[PDB]
């Protein structure tokens, strides 16, 4: 604890995400919505807006 400010311990957690690789397994908090067809809407498929 006597040592300098540049030599203090630092806990590091590194999060890595893989995307656009597989059907999604972990996803964030967002409620679902019933599907309609033959009408242009604002869709959202696992984070793909359009």
């Amino acid at each position: 604890p006597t040592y300098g400010v540049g030599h203090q311990p630092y806990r590091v957690v590194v999060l890595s995400f893989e995307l656009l690789h597989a059907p999604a397994t972990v996803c964030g908090p967002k409620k679902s919505t019933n599907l309609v067809k033959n009408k242009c809407v604002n869709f959202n498929f696992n984070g793909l807006t359009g």
Binding site: P1, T2, V5, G6, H7, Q8, P9, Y10, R11, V12, V13, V14, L15, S16, F17, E18, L19
Partner: protein
């Protein structure tokens, strides 16, 4: 757990000691790095080994 001098080495496209011999990150990294001080948790007056 690392020291304060090598927090900048945890990044894509960096060399050194931690970044080249211990923990190397890829160039196409898509993620987030969280680092915080732990002087009240991982420090001892007799030294840590």
């Amino acid at each position: 757990v690392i020291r304060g001098n090598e927090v900048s080495q945890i990044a894509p496209g960096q060399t050194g000691n931690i970044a080249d011999y211990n923990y190397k990150l890829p160039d196409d990294f898509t993620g987030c790095v969280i680092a915080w001080n732990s002087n009240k948790l991982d420090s001892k007056p007799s030294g840590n080994y």
